[PDB]
């Protein structure tokens, strides 16, 4: 209960008994932070909602398309290439 | 030996039987073309110098660091989450 008051305090839920961020995400694709609400979207366990967040993003406004390409490639293996090469890559994005 | 030739022709190999195509790529960075290297390098199965290439070319002159990255997630698997949205979004690319 004191971290659904938290997510409430950082607004990325409604205040009650809301067991999900999709009017978060809507609110934030209207407002045309595409970033932040493929960020929210992933942190709530969901690339397909992150990836179509950015390809939407990405309609608007070219770089979305290859971001939400890229965050697809998501693998579990510690000695995997993704991994090591997001990792180090990472700070390069704007 | 009528395929070396057949690249030789092509100019992804240098005159002679060195089995090899970095004395292209090297051209090529030179050269400024820094997309073509990287789908050259590819094309002789090695995406970590095609990483190498994109980054280096994201260095100088930063869309290639997300494309390195978007590279780096080559999973064959018939039904990954990669091929999935890859293979739709990459005609959306310049």
Redesign the interface.
Do not use: K
């Given at each position: 209960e004191e971290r659904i008051l938290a997510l409430q305090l950082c607004g990325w839920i409604k205040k009650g008994t809301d067991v999900d961020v999709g009017p978060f995400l809507n609110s934030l694709v209207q407002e045309g932070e595409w970033e932040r609400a493929a960020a929210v979207a992933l942190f709530n366990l969901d690339?397909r909602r992150a990836?179509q967040i950015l390809?939407e993003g990405?309609s608007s406004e070219?770089?979305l398309?290859?971001?939400?390409?890229?965050l697809?490639?998501?693998?579990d293996e510690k000695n995997s290439?993704?991994r090591?090469?997001?990792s180090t890559?990472?700070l390069?994005?704007?």
């Open positions: 690339i990836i390809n990405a070219l770089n398309n290859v971001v939400a390409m890229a697809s490639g998501y693998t290439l993704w090591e090469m997001c890559l990472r390069q994005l704007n």
